[PDB]
RNA sequence: GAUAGCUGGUUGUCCAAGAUAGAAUCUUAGUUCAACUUUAAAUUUGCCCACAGAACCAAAUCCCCUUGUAAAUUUAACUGU
RNA sequence: AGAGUGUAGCUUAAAAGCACCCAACUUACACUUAGGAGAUUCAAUUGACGCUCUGA
């Protein structure tokens, strides 16, 4: 027995727990993490921030909603521009975005005093 | 003779009060939806267009060479369109916009003259931040 | 918008205390106060006080 | 892996031959069923046991009535292999305030309101 | 998603034929890569 | 489990094996226009617009005027004048209502004042507050006028 | 009367609830946390839930109103697995 | 010579978008910067004139 005992070590990693934390229809508050995962899964949509680990987190109190909108990234990403140019005429990427439909308003004009 | 709580419906009130919430998202997507009065400039063949859309997509003020008016009398046409748009936005109430062109488009002389004319007309392109708290 | 002519009109040809507003924002969220925050900082108790001043029961 | 066994839509689709074989009909269908457990809850998954407990069928060979609605329909289908279903057809009017002490279930679903103890 | 009716809404790999050497068929009605030197 | 698509999926009518014989986007403005046109569509699955959603004579005269203006050359194109009073007069006399209706719709005038039923203004209008003999404060569609300047009836 | 992750045993009647994903440990014949289970109490939602929602390189699964129900969260205990 | 078509090369809104070209980056094609060009053959769908099938 040599060269085939257990030289292929290293595979002893636990689960990273990276998925969806607030499914669609849930009343998420401002600041809660919506999901965490590697590689841009759900691109940022309306009222959805992005941290450093390519994660998402709600910014306003509302219900989470997912749609399929066209993808038009920033010209900075030369790789994205190249991939787009490599597509034919009638071609669309259609990525998965995330939205947060706001419920409450930003404020209300209340009566202070009668002068 | 006053209600316990006031209720305003003017969509422009919150937009001008610097309190209307913007689309903080759309970070990886271009252009960014965080604004109140985006100034989109379209350049086509034989004509030029400059729009001032809204977050919902409603055009408020704009100017085109096909207006059977300014067509009378191509950086000159761009400057004229910019001046007309600035005057219309001033007489209409708009005074702040956000222009997010492309690098090859921002490094152009036409866009430079357009921005110069817009600034001379009396319109700032910065849009103050949204007051929180 | 607001101006001094508005107040002049109100106090001259209206005869009634004019109203005043401030546009108040909704209060903070602050979820249910947990008994054992465990991983929360010392500022956890600061989010549920009224208000900072030294309050003492009976002595 | 033994997952939650589902049922397609082609199964629950009564055909003219099925209607001719039995007595039921599509137009003006029954409104209540006669649930009667004929199989134990043991040797079956836990969700089936929970469904049986919710339906109230602890004592087997006992009659039970439930609403004939999509929700209850699926709840029944979930354990169809453990319960007997039959329609509750009332020959006469529903049990009035006066017909509540003298009643009877009778097999083949026939709730009689004038339950007596004499021969015809 | 797979089960949802919106499956394959962002399949773009097949739209790009990512990767000329000696490729001169000449069998059927075809002409291989040509060269024209502009002296 | 695999379900069929209700409507036609995108990029399905151009998924031919002859991808090299297609146009292939060589720029970014064309792709932006295509994306805008696609977003401006109903779509059968989802979209961002779900939760947050006599003439011949005039044409001949315009062509003649354009030809005359072009032949007048001006030489200052290589940086010109281009007045504004004539343009303003034309806008107020020609397509003034075209933009006035858009402004009213953006401000919510027809849906709030008339409770719907939009229309187009036929005859123009001009109003300006008089801050004495001069200067005069104009009241344009959406101008910011102070209550002090509005202390008297305008002209 | 040493210690000892170890062998052995640990006294009358009856009722009820009562089977565990894993991690660390000079550690896998032992210990802790977590999880299961028990007692008294304050709260309201616990499970199958229906349209829909949930990825480029097959049985399925998550949220899920009406609907069957009466179960669930927490507080204070502590042995047992 | 019987019949058909009739906004520039393409699109039905009948005066627009694509499409095209010279000058610069380009060894070269291109994305770009600055410039150029254009149609309704006429009568208050109606009849005649560029073009299409019939030893013509
Ligand atoms: Mg592995
Ligand atoms: Mg001892
Ligand atoms: Mg030991
Ligand atoms: Mg022993
Ligand atoms: Mg003893
Ligand atoms: Mg027991
Ligand atoms: Mg150690």
Swiss-Prot record, chain A:
Q: Does the entry feature the keyword Mitochondrion, yes or no?
A: yes
User: Which keywords describe this protein according to UniProt?
Assistant: Mitochondrion, Ribonucleoprotein, Ribosomal protein, Transit peptide
**Coiled-coil region(s):** none
MF GO annotations? RNA binding; structural constituent of ribosome
> Does the record's keyword annotation contain Ribonucleoprotein?
yes
Write down the superkingdom of origin: Eukaryota
Localization (cell): Mitochondrion
A single GO BP: translation
Task: State a GO cellular component annotated for this protein.
Answer: mitochondrion
- Tell me which family the UniProt entry assigns to this protein: Belongs to the bacterial ribosomal protein bL27 family.
Its subunit composition reads: Component of the mitochondrial large ribosomal subunit (mt-LSU). Mature mammalian 55S mitochondrial ribosomes consist of a small (28S) and a large (39S) subunit. The 28S small subunit contains a 12S ribosomal RNA (12S mt-rRNA) and 30 different proteins. The 39S large subunit contains a 16S rRNA (16S mt-rRNA), a copy of mitochondrial valine transfer RNA (mt-tRNA(Val)), which plays an integral structural role, and 52 different proteins.
- Protein name (Swiss-Prot/TrEMBL): Large ribosomal subunit protein bL27m
Could you tell me which species this protein originates from? Homo sapiens
Question: What is the gene name?
Answer: MRPL27
Section covered of the full-length record: 34 to 148 of 148
From Swiss-Prot, chain C:
User: According to its UniProt record, where is this protein located?
Assistant: Mitochondrion
Share what the entry says about its subunit structure, partners included.
Component of the mitochondrial large ribosomal subunit (mt-LSU). Mature mammalian 55S mitochondrial ribosomes consist of a small (28S) and a large (39S) subunit. The 28S small subunit contains a 12S ribosomal RNA (12S mt-rRNA) and 30 different proteins. The 39S large subunit contains a 16S rRNA (16S mt-rRNA), a copy of mitochondrial valine transfer RNA (mt-tRNA(Val)), which plays an integral structural role, and 52 different proteins. mL38 is located at the central protuberance.
Please report which protein family the annotation says this sequence is part of: Belongs to the phosphatidylethanolamine-binding protein family. Mitochondrion-specific ribosomal protein mL38 subfamily.
The protein's name in its UniProt record: Large ribosomal subunit protein mL38
The record lists the organism as Homo sapiens
Q: Which gene encodes it?
A: MRPL38
In terms of the parent sequence, the fragment covers 322 to 380 of 380
UniProtKB/Swiss-Prot annotation, chain D:
According to the UniProt entry, its GO molecular function terms are:
structural constituent of ribosome
GO CC terms, sorted: mitochondrial inner membrane; mitochondrial large ribosomal subunit; mitochondrion
Q: Which residues cross the membrane?
A: none
Q: Is S-adenosyl-L-methionine found in the keyword set?
A: no
Q: Which UniProt keywords apply?
A: Mitochondrion, Ribonucleoprotein, Ribosomal protein, Transit peptide
The places in or outside the cell where this protein is found are: Mitochondrion
Q: Which GO terms describe its biological process?
A: mitochondrial translation
Q: How does it assemble?
A: Component of the mitochondrial large ribosomal subunit (mt-LSU). Mature mammalian 55S mitochondrial ribosomes consist of a small (28S) and a large (39S) subunit. The 28S small subunit contains a 12S ribosomal RNA (12S mt-rRNA) and 30 different proteins. The 39S large subunit contains a 16S rRNA (16S mt-rRNA), a copy of mitochondrial valine transfer RNA (mt-tRNA(Val)), which plays an integral structural role, and 52 different proteins.
- Provide the family line: Belongs to the universal ribosomal protein uL30 family.
Name assigned to this protein: Large ribosomal subunit protein uL30m
Q: Which residues of the full protein are shown?
A: 35 to 154 of 161
From Swiss-Prot, chain E:
Q: Which domain of life is it from?
A: Eukaryota
Cellular location of this protein? Mitochondrion
Family assignment? Belongs to the mitochondrion-specific ribosomal protein mL48 family.
Instruction: Please describe the quaternary structure of this protein.
Output: Component of the mitochondrial large ribosomal subunit (mt-LSU). Mature mammalian 55S mitochondrial ribosomes consist of a small (28S) and a large (39S) subunit. The 28S small subunit contains a 12S ribosomal RNA (12S mt-rRNA) and 30 different proteins. The 39S large subunit contains a 16S rRNA (16S mt-rRNA), a copy of mitochondrial valine transfer RNA (mt-tRNA(Val)), which plays an integral structural role, and 52 different proteins. mL48 is located at the central protuberance. Interacts with OXA1L.
List the protein's name: Large ribosomal subunit protein mL48
Protein species of origin: Homo sapiens (Human)
